[PDB]
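Thread: Modeling a multi-component assembly for a lab meeting

Hi all, long-time lurker, first post. My supervisor asked me to bring a structural picture of a complex we are working on to next week's group meeting, and I have zero experience with this. I have the sequence lines for every component (683 residues in total). Could someone generate the structure of the whole assembly? Inputs are pasted exactly as I received them:
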Amino acid sequence: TRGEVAYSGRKIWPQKHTGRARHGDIGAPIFVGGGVVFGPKPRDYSYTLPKKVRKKGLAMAVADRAREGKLLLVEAFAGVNGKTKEFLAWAKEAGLDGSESVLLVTGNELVRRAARNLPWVVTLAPEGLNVYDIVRTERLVMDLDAWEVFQNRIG
Amino acid sequence: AKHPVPKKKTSKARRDARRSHHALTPPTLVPCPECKAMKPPHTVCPECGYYAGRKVLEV
Amino acid sequence: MKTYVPKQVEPRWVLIDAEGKTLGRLATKIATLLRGKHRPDWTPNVAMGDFVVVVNADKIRVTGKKLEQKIYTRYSGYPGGLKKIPLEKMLATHPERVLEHAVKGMLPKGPLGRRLFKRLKVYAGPDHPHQAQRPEKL
Amino acid sequence: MFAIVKTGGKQYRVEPGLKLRVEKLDAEPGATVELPVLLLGGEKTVVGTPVVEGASVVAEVLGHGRGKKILVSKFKAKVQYRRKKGHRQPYTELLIKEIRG
Amino acid sequence: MEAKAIARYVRISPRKVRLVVDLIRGKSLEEARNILRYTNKRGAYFVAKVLESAAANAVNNHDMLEDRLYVKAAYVDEGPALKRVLPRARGRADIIKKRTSHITVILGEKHGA
Amino acid sequence: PRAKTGVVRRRKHKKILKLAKGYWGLRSKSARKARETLFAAGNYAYAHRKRRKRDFRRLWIVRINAACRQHGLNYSTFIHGLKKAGIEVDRKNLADLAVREPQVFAELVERAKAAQG
RNA sequence: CCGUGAGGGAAAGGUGAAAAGAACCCCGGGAGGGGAGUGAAAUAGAGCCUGAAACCGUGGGCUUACAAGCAGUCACGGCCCCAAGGGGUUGUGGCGUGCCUAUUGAAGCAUGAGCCGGCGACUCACGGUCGUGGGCGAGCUUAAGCCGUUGAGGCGGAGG
RNA sequence: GGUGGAGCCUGGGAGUGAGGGCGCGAGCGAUAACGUCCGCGUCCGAGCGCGGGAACAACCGAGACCGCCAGCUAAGGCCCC
RNA sequence: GGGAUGACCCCAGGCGGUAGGGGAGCGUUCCCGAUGCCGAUGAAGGCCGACCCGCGAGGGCGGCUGGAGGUAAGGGAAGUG
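Re: Modeling a multi-component assembly
Sure thing. I ran the full set together rather than chain by chain. Output:
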C-alpha cells in the first residue's frame, strides 16, 4: 500500500501557485515510487467443503473408474524389498505395461518405494486416497487392505 | 515568458517553409592566372600571389 | 454501373444578342449554357460548357426604374471605402460590365465557377473580335 | 442486341456476354436462370407497359460471394458512443448468355 | 562501387552543418573541395575532413581513380545531445542541449569512354 | 499475479494508425490524433453513402432533363408520360439512353407524349 | 544530490558458446571512419541481445505558386507501381462546427491536453442480504485442536 | 372492444432528486425580458443523427440494425447559384 | 410453427439513445491439463501484408527480423485492457 512505502509524508510542493499539478506525498499511487492500490495481500484460499460431499466424490470417483474397467484390486506382491526392478517385472505379469498412467494405493511401504520413481505411476498410502489423484490417473490399483479402508471411509 | 508567447506549436510544414530562404550560396571563385588555382576574385591568394606584388613565399 | 462520363467534349461557340432583352432573363440562360447543362452529358466536375459571345451588350432593357436605383457596390479594403454606383453610370461606362456581373452571380462560386465565367465573352457592339465559328442562338 | 433486365429491385443493361454481381439469387451454384423480368431491346422493343411479355434473358450463375468488407462506424460526441459494424454484401455473378424474346 | 565515410559524434548542431553538406551534393570531388575551402562556416571543416576520408577509401581501398570521383550521396544524422545546466534570473535554471552530429559522405564514379 | 499492460496497448494503437494512412500531419502519426479523425471519417462515410444514393438520383435527372428538352418537352412532363404509359422502367439510372442509344430515347419520348394529347 | 539541522533522497542490470574484444594498411591532430581479421551471427563491436513510438534525415513515386481551410469523406478523372483485379497519389465536383469534461445549452471566445512511450483508479478480510450451482435433509454443519501427508486426507459435535 | 416492450403481485440492482424551450391557461412583472412562479401538452435533454427553415437544441417534416449507381412520398420547393 | 430439435429451416413483430439495469464475448498475468505437446527445418517479442475467419473486441496465414523459449482442448485464479 501507499502507506507501507518508505517515502516520507512531506508535502511535495505547495498545492497552490506553483503552476504544477496538486500533490501530497510521493508515495501516492500516481507516482512510480508509490504504493500499489488494491494489490494482493497474503490470504488463505482454504474453505471447508462438506465432508459428505467428499465421501460422495471419493466413492463416485472410484466408481467411474470401476465402470471404465480400470479398477483392479490385487493381492500378489512378490515384488518386494522395494526395488523399481522388481515392481516393474511384477507389473509386466499384471499387464501393467506403462501405456497408461496408474494410481497404486497400498499400505505396504516396500511396494511404495518400488514404484514412485516410475514416471507413469503415482504412488500413495490409502489414507491419501482422494479424487484428484484418482482422476489424474488413468488406471486404479488397490491393495485389498486398501480396499478395506476405502470401504470404511464410506459405508 | 511574460506578455507574448507562441500560441501553437508550429507545423513542420510551416517551419520548413519559413526556412525556404536558408540555403547558402556557393562561394564565388575563379582561376588564378599564372598558377593553377581557384580563388575568389580581387584577392591575393597563396597559390601564387600576383606579379610585381606581394604574397606568401616563392622563388 | 455506368460511368456514362465523357472524354474531353468538343466545346461550342455561340453568338447571342437580344439587344433589347431584360438582363437577368438573358443572364439566366447564358449561365445554363456556361455549365454544360442543356447538353445531356452534364458533368458537374468538369466544364464541358459552351463559349458564349454576347454582342451588342449595352442596349439591354430593364424593368421599372433601375437607373439611379440599381446600385452596384465596391468595398476597397479601407475606411470609408464603400462605393455605390447607379446602373445608369455602369451603362454610361463599362456597359459590358453590367451583363457580366449579373451572369457571374448566377454561376457556382468555386474554382470551376470562376473558370466557366471566362468562357463568356461580352461586347457592347456589335462586332465580335474572334471569328472562330458562332452558331447564332435566338 | 441490348436488353434492360431487372433483379434485386435494381435494373441493368445487359448484353450477350458479361454480367457482374447482383444479390442472392436462390440459384444452384452453376445453374441457369431466366431473368423473364425484362424491359427493352437493341432494335427498339420498348415495353408496351412495364415488362415485354414472353421475353427473357438467360444468364448462367457463375457462383456466390461476399463483397469487399465495408466498415460501418457510428460515433456520437460527449456521450461515449462508439460502434463497429463489419459489413460484406453477398451476391451472385452471372454471365449473360442470350436475349430471347 | 562507392566509398563511404561518416564522422560520428562531431559536436556541432546537425541543423547547422547540413547547411554546408547541401552545398556539395552531386558534385565532383574537385568542385566540393573548392566549395568547402572558401565557404564561411565552421561546418565546412568537419565536412571537408569527412569528404577527404571517403576519397582515401575510394582510391586506397576500392581502387576507384580520383578524377572520376563525385559525391553520390551525403547527409548528417543527429547523435545524442549533451544536456547542460544554464542558470537564469530568479533562480530559474535551464537545460541546454549541446547537439552532436553523425556526418556521412559517399562517393562514386562518373561517365565513361 | 501481476498482469502488466505488456504488448496490448501498442497494438490497439497501431491498428488505428494503419487506418490513418495518408492523413495530413499528426493525424497520421499521433496515436490519438488519428483516433479522433477516424470517428469523424467514419460518420462522414456513412452519411456520405446515403448521399451518394441521392447524388446520382440527381445526376441522372439533370441529363435526362437535358436530352428530353432536346425534343421540345421537359422532365416534369416527360415523367408524367412514362408514368401513365406504364413504363415505370426507365429508372433514372437507365435513361443513360440519353447518351448511348438516343435512338431509343427518342422513341421513349414519343411514347411519353402519346399518353398526353 | 538537497538542507544550518532534524531530515529529505534518486538514477544507473544484459556483447558472445568462448574475448576469439578486431594485429597490420589507409584518411584524420585526435574522435571517428574504410579495408583486413574473429565469430554461426558484427544492422552481436563494447553501456554492445531484443531494438516499438514520438522526433530528425536521405532517396524514390504521385502532387501543388487565382484559391478560403476541424483537413476528412463521397464521386469522377489523371499520373505511378504488379493485372479485365488491385495498391499509391490527388485535380475538380458534392457534403462536413475537433476530442474529453461540465452543462438547460459547447466548434465554441467554458475545463483538461506539446507529442510519443511506459506507471496510473470499484479491491480484500469478516459479518450481512438477495440470487444461483451443488450436498444432505427434520435436520445441517462442525471451531480451535489432535493424527496422517510432505502439493493426501482423516479425525474432532464445545458450539452454531 | 383492446395481446400491448400493456397491466397486477413478490423480490435484486439503479440513476434522478440542477432542467430547458414552445403552445395553451393563470399569478408575479410594466397586457417588459432568451424574466420569474405554478398548471395541461409537447419536444431538447438522451434524437448537435436525417429533410425544410440561408446559417440555428427543442418552429415544419420525420423516430436513423447494415447494404444498393432502384422506386413513391413528407415539410418545403420547381428563373440561375 | 416445425418437431427424423437439425440450435437447422419457414411465419410475425421489433432493433436512435445519456444516467442507469441486464445479457453474451474478446484479450492480458498466473495455475491444473504437464515426467505431456511445439521449438534451431527457428520460441517470445518486433517490422510489413492489397490474403483468410470473426458484427466486434480479436483469431489465423504469408514474407522480413529475432535468436530460446512457448504452450491446446477444457477448467481455475487475478496487481487484467
